Amino acid sequence: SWMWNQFFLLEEYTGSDYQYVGKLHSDQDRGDGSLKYILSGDGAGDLFIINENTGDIQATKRLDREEKPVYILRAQAVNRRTGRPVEPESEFIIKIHDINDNEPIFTKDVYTATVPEMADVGTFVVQVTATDADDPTYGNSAKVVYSILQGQPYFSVESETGIIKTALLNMDRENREQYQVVIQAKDMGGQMGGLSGTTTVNITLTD
Amino acid sequence: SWMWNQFFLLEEYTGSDYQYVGKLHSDQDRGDGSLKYILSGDGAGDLFIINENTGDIQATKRLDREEKPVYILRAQAVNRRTGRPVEPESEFIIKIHDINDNEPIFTKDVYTATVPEMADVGTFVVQVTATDADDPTYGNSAKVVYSILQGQPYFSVESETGIIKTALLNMDRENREQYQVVIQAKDMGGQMGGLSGTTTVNITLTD
Numbered sequence: 001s002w003m004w005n006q007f008f009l010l011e012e013y014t015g016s017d018y019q020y021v022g023k024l025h026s027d028q029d030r031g032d033g034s035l036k037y038i039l040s041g042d043g044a045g046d047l048f049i050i051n052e053n054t055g056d057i058q059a060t061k062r063l064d065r066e067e068k069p070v071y072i073l074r075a076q077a078v079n080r081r082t083g084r085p086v087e088p089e090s091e092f093i094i095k096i097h098d099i100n101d102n103e104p105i106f107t108k109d110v111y112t113a114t115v116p117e118m119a120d121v122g123t124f125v126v127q128v129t130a131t132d133a134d135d136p137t138y139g140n141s142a143k144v145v146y147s148i149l150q151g152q153p154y155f156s157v158e159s160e161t162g163i164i165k166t167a168l169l170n171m172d173r174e175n176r177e178q179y180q181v182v183i184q185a186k187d188m189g190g191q192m193g194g195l196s197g198t199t200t201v202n203i204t205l206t207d
Numbered sequence: 208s209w210m211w212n213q214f215f216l217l218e219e220y221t222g223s224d225y226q227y228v229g230k231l232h233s234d235q236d237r238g239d240g241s242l243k244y245i246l247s248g249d250g251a252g253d254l255f256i257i258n259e260n261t262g263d264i265q266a267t268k269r270l271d272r273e274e275k276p277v278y279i280l281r282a283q284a285v286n287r288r289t290g291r292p293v294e295p296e297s298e299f300i301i302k303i304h305d306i307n308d309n310e311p312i313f314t315k316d317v318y319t320a321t322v323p324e325m326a327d328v329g330t331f332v333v334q335v336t337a338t339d340a341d342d343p344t345y346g347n348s349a350k351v352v353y354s355i356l357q358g359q360p361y362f363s364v365e366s367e368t369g370i371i372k373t374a375l376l377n378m379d380r381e382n383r384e385q386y387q388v389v390i391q392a393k394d395m396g397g398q399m400g401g402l403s404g405t406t407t408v409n410i411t412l413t414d
């Protein structure tokens with residue numbers, strides 16, 4: 001069975017007037033003003049308001065998907081003068097749809113790691129991770145790619161995983177023992193307009 | 208019966224990602240990738256594209272309600288491992304929601320009229336009309352009011368009808384043979400912020 005009883009509402013609305021949600025409507029409404037639509041449930045009456053004559057629903061406040069992603073409501077259609085139901089009461093949901101408004105955040109601002117000197121190219125150093133609070137199931141808003149801002153050619157980072165590896169042969173601890181790497185995480189798959197964060201990785205060569 | 212098989216899509220979208228429409232969903236869908244959502248009908252694949260795995264629908268182009276206000280599409284769902292359909296083909300509509308982006312347009316940029324010099328106050332002169340292409344059924348985007356910008360105190364205008372009538376033209380001791388009235392038409396019921404148009408009315412006096 002198809003699931004139709006839902007509305008989709010963009011988060012973080014900043015328009016001047018109220019944000020339009022959609023319209024409840026019974027195919028028994030002849031538009032003669034004898035029918036009344038009633039909204040109840042989570043947010044009914046303040047956050048979500050209805051035009052009782054037409055079924056039009058509006059949202060009265062800017063909503064944040066990361067705070068609350070879905071609202072469960074109920075719809076009624078009744079005779080205006082008797083209150084007798086014309087449609088059976090029915091549940092429906094208002095789904096808050098994601099925009100890319102959260103930047104990647106690294107689990108640590110400073111990572112500490114070691115790797116042996118004279119390691120072969122590709123030796124594992126450390127894995128960094130940036131989380132993203134946007135919706136991973138739609139679009140690229142939460143798809144993070146890693147890149148090295150500081151530390152090439154001594155090190156590399158896997159773009160999809162944040163795994164840092166050695167990238168230069170014959171690194172001598174006696175020459176330089178400590179390396180400070182900076183990694184960037186950018187969402188939207190690293191594409192134009194993506195939001196970004198950075199972290200610092202202090203790497204010490206061992207024997 | 209409740210009419211749930213509709214999505215509501217704001218016209219004139221200018222974002223840099225595809226505008227989200229909504230999601231098809233079958234309660235036979237176990238999120239294991241075995242179901243394939245299919246979109247057919249008016250604009251399917253060109254104006255409206257679907258994620259075959261999730262049922263998410265996007266619009267590929269800025270849409271104009273005044274050009275086309277509704278699209279009729281069909282939803283289908285097939286089982287990958289059997290190749291057989293799992294839902295009945297089902298129609299739904301994508302309804303394009305209005306914004307106030309059309310100003311009142313007068314049927315003529317220049318109207319031509321005459322009125323006898325010594326007519327009673329309130330004599331009919333000419334009716335101007337400014338039409339508004341926005342949605343008359345939502346808000347005041349298509350609610351037009353007329354005012355006189357030029358030609359008072361000689362002529363008045365009915366705010367609702369655009370009917371220009373004589374006012375204090377008989378009290379004009381400066382016997383003039385030519386007059387020019389300017390009417391403004393403003394939508395949003397005339398309230399601040401609405402869009403506006405104007406017209407010119409050339410009036411000649413007669414005996």
Ligand SMILES: [Ca+2]
Pocket residue numbers: 011012063064065066067101
């Ligand atoms: Ca948010």
Ligand SMILES: [Ca+2]
Pocket residue numbers: 100101102103104132133134141142187188195
């Ligand atoms: Ca993000």
Ligand SMILES: [Ca+2]
Pocket residue numbers: 011065066098099100101102133134135
């Ligand atoms: Ca978000």
Ligand SMILES: [Ca+2]
Pocket residue numbers: 218219271272273274308
């Ligand atoms: Ca338009």
Ligand SMILES: [Ca+2]
Pocket residue numbers: 218272273305306307308309340341342
């Ligand atoms: Ca419009």
Ligand SMILES: [Ca+2]
Pocket residue numbers: 307308309310311339340341348349350394395402
């Ligand atoms: Ca208008």
Ligand SMILES: [Ca+2]
Pocket residue numbers: 324376377379380381382383
């Ligand atoms: Ca005169």
